[PDB]
Symmetry: D2
């Protein structure tokens, strides 16, 4: 359609999407089927590049793309991004439909993601708040007298952006945006599960003027991407995905600059003075949004004795009164999970919790190979820590509810999971809140709201098993830029007179 | 002596230095002999910890040290560091003698290093220029209206500091200083080649009040240290050493925060308008200081046609008029190289250059198993790139001299090595200098001076094979600290009236 | 026309422009004739407000405008500014024609100013690089332990923007932009000499959505404006104009936040190694642009012995080969000066220089009541300091040329004027340049270019008689914003455990 | 004694303190008697300088001191300040005794001030967090392409520090410290009421190595100081004192850089959820400390209906159980007010409140010409606004207590005074606190503590009648430093390739 007009190869009934090889759309490696979780049907195919095409693409990115991106002044890069935003925006419905179909995303969620992608592109100028360099006077030390330094940021070169299946459009646009804005060339490697949105975004950027040899989109399955991560021409790896793959990526990449957003779930804590209506609403939402397939989804709810009853009651009502089905209905609240495998795991995990003293408070019923009801499992503090739902991230709409004596116990249980992405705290007392802020070991804490990374207006990232470094408007500069120091020596040259 | 009074075990004629196990000096693993490069004699032994002692130490650092360091307010950490500086300073001669003996460092160089270590400790307060956090208003986006965020730094926890043999005292004090100042516990792992200075520095810090369970000094040989790097309780690895080991470290560590200073040599460029007296002096020095065993040692000299003759002549005179011998003589200029193996490599490399069209302009003579003359090898631009001296870092006092047509050719040859730590440029024209600053792919550029990292008053670090990230007063905060974001939600709470 | 359709009162043959009274266009004070310097003819009239209307307007700005501006979120303020930019841009020719007619600005200069105004409005988002606040941890002092502070910027309230005649459009848009972007209401008071462009800009902002009660445009002659400056409801005064008026403004205003851009001329220094073609061109331009009616116009040229001859020769050729006349001709280079009075002063000053040993090298001829030739007067170093052209700012296209022995003498003569706005330095030696940078007492130094403030991409402002504080994208935040500190006390509350 | 050994002229029974004239202690103007508020007796005399000595001193400061301060590298300035701290510290008792005697300060308060002065001097290195400059890339605008700028701070030159009577030692050391640390020369003008401590501090700095011609201490009565403020050689005026004098200072000084800390009192608000024990204690203290002669003293207490009774009861008990008398007794809590005149005003003001419906809840009794009891006057919200105690700052230990319906009314009453220095808020609800933070128009807000500027670890300053700009460690740099911009032009020079 319009955008991918001459790109998509209509062959054998299903549209065939090629990879973009830093100059031309193409590919001559195995073709791979892309399915919809809505009906397990094949909706398209993508052409992966061969080994020689990967090698040739990296060579173009390194030898030419680095310079095309860097030698395009920032004023023009910004124009490129603002124009790409316009193109995506006018093709909004088309972008959204693919998200609904390829990712099983409910209509309102698909529309929200496209819009986040557009805003991210349009606010590229706010990323400049952290682009200026430093001027360091030398007279504060005897050894540096009559000396001085300039510290400025420089693009690293080629950034490999590896994206997860759950934000197939936004994650790719976000990484491309902060990488390009600072002068880098970029290699995008989307989940082979739903690579269509990224293909569309990359086409819009190319139409907008993005230097043709400074970007690549390689539809490669997981382990074939290792080839890219391990290459010396790739100076940085921005990876968003699971902990286990993140580990593999670093061990394969070796010394390089990395940003690792490794998810895991998020705990929510409700203090006795919390507005329970606000909390119940925000928590229910954090649990089921996009069928819990959000890195920042609430997986554990801790509530102090006096509000626990009401709170868990309201959240249960809110969850069971939800409509599950095909994501196309603007009436549906929850669509399918990405694969039948994901549902299998959620069910096995719910059973595990029950066998260990847990009781289902809402949901619990599987509705098909990829459909399930958002579940809320109550569990006694003394047994919760051994439950699979606590010890692991079950990427589905399921959370545990645990009653706690006080803030200290809530903090301890929240910190007991191996992850540390975000945490949410509902309450009003400034002291209790300040204590929780200090002691919760996570990259971000949301006071009186559900965790929501949005477009990264506020930086976010993990602690512990949730990764390292941050993404965010401005802050992402640390991940795809290197400092360059220039020290000038004027010793005895008469600039200063002993100072 | 005084400092390590009850610590050193005088047994079997040679002093035996134990490891510090986050509470008590000890160790029950193999004992290892420490030799002096001055005479290849055994001057001490160090006790490495057993597997159980490594495990127990990490456990203490993680469970107790994190909190002892963090729960000691900054005002007190600063007092600890200022007191440790006083102790090292009054034991200056003793610290220097060990450097001379254990590292083969010339007296003036040993004294300089001790003093750099003292200054680094005393200037810990300048590290606070980058400790403050950010306050982000939320009204610049519609989605964040009536919201706002705080971004503050937090210690990561346990930092593993792995140090090289050539700055055995300073590197250990530098890493301990920037790690502790931000609230982290630290595990120090010095080169097993010359671990004595670090043992002494750690003792001075402990005497100064450094939280006893927040530091460890493990005398472990290279590959036994892997155990520490790979442990999940180690949240950061500050590594200074060679490229090849740096790579191994990351592949073993996996996802973690890293600073990798991987050295390599540095090229020096002399423009036609350069003060040749200043240049000849600075370049000779950059070539031979500490027998070229400096990451920032000059390994390649590029000089434009019109000054090449004079320049290389003066540098040759300066180099051959140097006195080599035992580092104790305040008269000696160059002491021994750390091992006979290192000299073997320098000789093999000089031969390689000769066989490939190179001509020795100064030095070239080996004077013993660990002694050699600082060598200056001239080479034609058309053959230099294939020489071992160009393609690799030969950690010894040896550099190549290459005549070039112009700045473009100089820049191209400087960038042809696989490293990118620093570069030096001598000249006066602002345009040529600005061009070189932009195009030299290195972490730092020194205008009209030899590259010298000093105490990191100006940040430094590598590009390409020279590593990632920076160290420096203030800038090191990015390597041992993680951001924590706190987002407050006041939507509809009446703080703002639509804004 | 289009923009000021229902605003302009076509009465008595000449268009009558009313003042904008924070809600409605109007005015009932004396009417004042506005003339064109091109033909001394009346081209319009402006209605000044009466004393009661000034009082009522300030009251509206204080009681309502402060809140309308502040309570409009930044995301919307930005939209208002981007839309105002679009409106000005599509009315470009109309804006330019008024500049040509009302200010006597050459066509290319008028177009440049309109465009600068449009860019300034569109880049309002870059002003956010300095809008974030600070988060100060309290453990670095014993007295502040268990305490912490937040420092954030807040609008001051009502900013009075007083503008000069020479950048009638840009200065007004610049001040309105940085004042509004941070949440302030604004009172604009343009030169009564050429207030038409400001009236048009304010109308475009109002059409774009600028909160109607948060802005005012008062066509008041100089001393009647004092009433506004002295009012307690005006929290800040952004004044661009002459030194003498600036002084009066502060003495009338009393304690308030001020930015004073008080001009004066600028000296240019040419080192012996300078590209004389670049220098001669840039200097000629700095001397005659807009008939020298630029605060940053070059009024003194200092050139080292060896290049002096050539340099002054080339600049003289360039100046006398200029075409003076009506600014409408896209062929004319120099239009008229703002008033016959200004020309009188330039002639008297040129005579003074001649009587004191000076010799005219180019120009010197008056061509009419408001027209003159750009003049270049040579003068011996030993007598220049007593010349009116040196001691004062003669706001016309006239500069002195003085030969100097060396950089020290050039710096001394440049610093001998009572002003210190900018200075220009042409040359290539990094040491000489660095010395001049340190010792020239001015707000800004331009290396190898003529001084040009542009839209303030780089901050600018004066030293000495040239004023205080800076304007510039981002930096202007200090002039119309106040810090607010919030200190939180958690002493003994268990957040920290002695830290 | 020791410090002022050869300086003090013991003549006619009373010690005679000379002024310091930027080189030598001396003075030949009228002698002025200095009295103690403890017994109204003459305890010393100070020699004011004649008109010629003021003129000569300014000339030395301008021509020589600017350069002596600036040409002393920062590393040395820091040493000077650390040594001055040591000297003051070992003369602690002597410094304290003079404060007790000359200012009537209770012993514990006098000791606290000396210590604050010592800490301020020792933490001068923390002021460097805001000393670095900026490096601005030019490719973000088409007009600035191939251009770039450096922005760095520069000392303004001579700073005139005018200090109030209530912090005679600290204010002088604070201003001297932040002025000198950035490279400025300083003229100190203390209250002629208690100039002894400043004389002692200046002597300690001179003994510590402070450039002899870069500092001056002029014992001049109020209006004779105008001569200094109005001089063009004084580039900045740091003034701490009353509103009315501050206004005079600016009107006399004209265009200059100013910091005006103009005091006024501070309101305290107690929310219904506040810890009343903490609040009652902190508020009582804020009311009586140094007999209310603190710019940040609490002058108005607003308490919500439900806690008002208890709160005002506890504060009343705490206030009447205080011991008034000679400040020497380490038992006394409140010493005398600075002059009988000050007590007269407090009594007249208390009467005014009573006549207007107010009722005394504690104190109210005058105990002598300079002694009074700290008074707490209750007042109905409907009549408080017309009371002298509300409308003005009565510099004495007296505050009003007003019961309020809710936070909105508290905020409105707090904002009704003409001042806006600080405010205090006691409570725990994050929303109410956030609202108060936004709407209280003051320079600083203290949550759950009494307002205390301390040594300026957190910046402080006023809004409204309380002045402009801030003082504080780091932030004071904006008041005594000017930016200098250097723009480099490389257009067409081949540094960048269109970028
Ligand atoms: N805002 C703050 O941070 C702060 C701090 C401490 C004190 N204060 C305020 O200062 C006042 C108490 O001090 P004070 O009574 O000595 O007040 P003040 O205003 O009389 O002090 C003025 C200082 O300025 C000098 N001075 C007086 N007239 C002058 C003139 N015409 N020209 C130049 N200099 C002149 C005085 O000798 C004295 O040194 C109170 O109002 C208090 O709130 C404010
Ligand atoms: Na690698
Ligand atoms: Na790992
Ligand atoms: Na005033
Ligand atoms: Na003045």
């Amino acid at each position: 359609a319009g955008l991918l007009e001459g790109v998509i190869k209509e062959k054998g009934g299903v549209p065939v999407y090629p990879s973009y090889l830093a100059g031309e759309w193409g590919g001559s490696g195995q073709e791979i089927e892309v399915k919809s979780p809505i009906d397990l049907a094949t909706i398209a195919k993508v052409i992966s590049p061969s080994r020689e095409e990967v090698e040739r693409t990296l060579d173009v990115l390194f030898k030419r793309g680095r310079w095309s991106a860097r030698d395009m002044p920032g004023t023009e890069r910004l124009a490129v991004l603002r124009k790409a935003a316009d193109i995506i925006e006018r093709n909004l419905d088309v972008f959204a439909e693919v998200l609904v179909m390829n990712a099983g995303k409910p209509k309102s969620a698909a529309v929200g993601e496209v819009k986040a992608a557009v805003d991210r592109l349009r606010l590229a100028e706010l990323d400049l708040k952290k682009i200026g360099g430093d001027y360091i006077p030398g007279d504060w030390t005897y050894d540096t007298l009559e000396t001085e330094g300039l510290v400025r940021r420089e693009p690293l070169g080629v950034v490999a952006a590896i994206t997860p299946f759950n934000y197939p459009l936004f994650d790719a646009v976000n990484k491309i945006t902060y990488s390009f804005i600072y002068g880098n060339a970029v290699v995008v490697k989307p989940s082979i599960s739903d690579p269509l949105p990224a293909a569309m975004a990359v086409k819009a950027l190319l139409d907008a003027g993005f230097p043709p040899d400074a970007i690549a989109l390689l539809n490669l399955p997981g382990k074939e991407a290792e080839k890219i991560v391990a290459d010396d021409r790739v100076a940085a790896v921005s990876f968003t995905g699971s902990t286990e793959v993140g580990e593999r990526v670093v061990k394969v990449g070796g010394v390089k600059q990395y940003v690792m957003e490794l998810g895991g779930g998020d705990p929510a804590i409700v203090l006795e003075d919390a507005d329970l209506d606000l909390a119940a609403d925000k928590i229910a939402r954090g649990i089921y949004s996009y069928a819990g397939q959000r890195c920042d989804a609430i997986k554990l709810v801790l509530a102090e004795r006096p509000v626990y009853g009401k709170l868990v009651e309201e959240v249960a009502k809110r969850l069971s009164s939800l409509r599950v089905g095909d994501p196309r209905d603007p009436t549906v609240d929850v669509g399918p999970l990405i694969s039948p495998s994901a549902v299998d795991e959620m069910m096995a995990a719910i059973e595990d919790a029950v066998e260990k003293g847990g009781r289902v408070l809402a949901g619990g019923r599987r509705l098909g190979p990829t459909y399930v009801q958002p579940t809320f499992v109550e569990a006694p503090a003394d047994r919760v820590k051994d439950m699979v739902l606590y010890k692991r991230e079950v990427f589905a709409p399921v959370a545990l509810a645990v009653e706690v004596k006080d803030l200290d116990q809530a903090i301890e249980l929240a910190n007991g999971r191996p992850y540390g992405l975000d945490a949410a705290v509902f309450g009003r007392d400034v002291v209790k809140i300040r204590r929780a802020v200090r002691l919760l070991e996570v990259g971000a804490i949301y006071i009186n709201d559900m965790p929501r990374h949005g477009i990264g207006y506020y930086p976010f990232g993990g602690r512990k098993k949730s990764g390292v470094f941050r993404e965010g408007i401005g802050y992402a500069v640390e991940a795809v830029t290197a400092y360059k120091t220039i020290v000038f020596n004027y010793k005895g040259k008469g600039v200063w007179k002993y100072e």
